[PDB]
Write a protein that binds this ligand. Structure first.
Ligand SMILES: Cc1cc2nc3c(=O)[nH]c(=O)nc-3n(C[C@H](O)[C@H](O)[C@H](O)COP(=O)(O)OP(=O)(O)OC[C@H]3O[C@@H](n4cnc5c(N)ncnc54)[C@H](O)[C@@H]3O)c2cc1C
Ligand SMILES: Cc1cc2nc3c(=O)[nH]c(=O)nc-3n(C[C@H](O)[C@H](O)[C@H](O)COP(=O)(O)OP(=O)(O)OC[C@H]3O[C@@H](n4cnc5c(N)ncnc54)[C@H](O)[C@@H]3O)c2cc1C
Ligand SMILES: CCN(CC)CCC[C@@H](C)Nc1ccnc2cc(Cl)ccc12
Ligand SMILES: CCN(CC)CCC[C@@H](C)Nc1ccnc2cc(Cl)ccc12
Ligand SMILES: [Zn+2]
Ligand SMILES: [Zn+2]
Lengths: 230, 230
């Protein structure tokens, strides 16, 4: 049958390299017949802050507010904020979640960090216990499509940045695997600003071409060994 | 002399375990005679999103928005938003920057990620050249004071989360070292919600006591080996 894809997109500028990577993914996945949804976080003015406004109603323990405890309960009570609830429906129904973003400080831009913090709540994405291979989003795939300022060479073990896989750990393992996702190999488009027009068009085409057979891919083993070696 | 400290604090609840760690830091560093400032990001409703509103000057290219370029240029003309500008003054003058936060998704809460993204702009925190040991915040000390849900056992090589050092890499190396900070050993207070009240009190006391002698500690070698090696 057909597949559902959610692209969580975090760039301010539609004409950016990120925007182009997002658009070619929509084009290609749409052409295949997939159901495609894009959460364009900056266009949505998506709220990144984890606050008590994320629960509508009386808190369990208002005297000492604990975001995790209160959102866990709100999830069960169906009292989370609308924005969170709407994202959760998209994730729940998705077969594949693609994150499209520029690397900010070896991680996701804060608006996307806020999506992770607020949407992937206890009771929805994981339980304690009920994580990693017992996470609640088991059966789903995730894929990081990241662009960098630094070159591939800088992101090697002997480059000033260390290997690119090193910075993936909190995202792939600590977040996605934790919630039970299987993780498809990352798409890292290095240093588009430095690249020539030809190399840039090539990186966009490579992503589109990869997407043609994305459903045939197997996920990585999201292990310490995969990320760090030895 | 040389004992200005900025605490960048990211917890919603003054009565929280994080709040207590922040407060004992203020108490002890104030007692020493340090100059102490706290940026209480949630109380400030701090903006986490990197947007064009961060520039108060005329955009150089309003047709195609490039956050990096526009903020770099605006920094040099004192044309960044006042919230950023005010944080930059605090960092510029600080001799030590402590980050106090609960671990969210193997990283900082989004509101604190947004402080990093928006405050540490090119021209202020780094330049090219002017990064890693040559970063523009060279000579300053930084320290991560992190609290977790996961237990100490979980954050070992034999545990499900891997060594805690693994998740520090984007923060300590990719952010702090990149901007020229020397990085003091992290303070990780594991699993306060699982600890008894007395055990929590012990963790708070340990931090207060560590701070008595913080100014003469040796920084870590902020290398891949420290983070991922034996
Ligand atoms: C706050 C912050 C923190 C950062 N931290 C890091 C970090 O830790 N590590 C790191 O490596 N980098 C870092 N960077 C840099 C950042 O990752 C890059 O600037 C970003 O990845 C560039 O992607 P972009 O989409 O903005 O590029 P763009 O500047 O939009 O793209 C580059 C060029 O590609 C062109 N283009 C767009 N579409 C196409 C197309 N279809 N075909 C051909 N050309 C096209 C554009 O017009 C442009 O000329 C940071 C940046 C910021 C702002
Ligand atoms: C969105 C999200 C993502 C998360 N991701 C992760 C993750 O990736 N990895 C991970 O390990 N954890 C994760 N967690 C868990 C999170 O790190 C913990 O919930 C957090 O660190 C707990 O710290 P706290 O200050 O909020 O605790 P609190 O709940 O505030 O503290 C516990 C108790 O300490 C009491 N207390 C306060 N002061 C004192 C004192 N002086 N002496 C004794 N007791 C005191 C409080 O009253 C409270 O009852 C995540 C949580 C959320 C919400
Ligand atoms: C000389 C090149 N300059 C000067 C303006 C163009 C700006 C390019 C910017 C986006 N590159 C970067 C911006 C911010 N952080 C980074 C971190 C790493 Cl590791 C590598 C490159 C980065
Ligand atoms: C009131 C219910 N209490 C039990 C004490 C829940 C406390 C458990 C919470 C903090 N644990 C966690 C919450 C959220 N994420 C996590 C990620 C990892 Cl890796 C490990 C533990 C996590
Ligand atoms: Zn994993
Ligand atoms: Zn380092």
């Amino acid at each position: 049958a057909g597949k559902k894809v959610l692209i969580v997109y975090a760039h301010q500028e539609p004409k950016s390299f990120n925007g182009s990577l997002k658009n070619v993914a929509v084009d290609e996945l749409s052409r295949q017949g997939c159901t495609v949804t894009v959460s364009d976080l900056y266009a949505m003015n998506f709220e990144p802050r984890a606050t008590d406004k994320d629960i509508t109603g009386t808190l369990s323990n208002p005297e000492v507010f604990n975001y995790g405890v209160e959102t866990h309960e709100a999830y069960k009570q169906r009292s989370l904020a609308s924005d969170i609830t709407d994202e959760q429906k998209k994730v729940r129904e998705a077969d594949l979640v693609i994150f499209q973003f520029p690397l900010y400080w070896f991680s996701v831009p804060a608006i996307l960090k806020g999506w992770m913090d607020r949407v992937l709540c206890q009771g929805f994405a994981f339980d304690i216990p009920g994580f990693y291979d017992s996470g609640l989003l088991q059966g789903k795939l995730a894929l990081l499509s990241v662009t960098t300022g630094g070159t591939a060479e800088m992101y090697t073990k002997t480059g000033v940045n260390g290997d690119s896989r090193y910075f993936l750990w909190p995202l792939q393992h600590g977040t996605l695997h934790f919630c039970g996702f299987k993780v498809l190999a990352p798409q890292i488009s290095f240093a588009p600003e430095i690249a020539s027009e030809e190399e840039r068009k090539g990186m966009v085409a490579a992503w589109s071409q990869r997407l043609q057979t994305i459903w045939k891919e197997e996920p990585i083993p999201c292990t310490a060994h995969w990320h760090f070696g030895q």
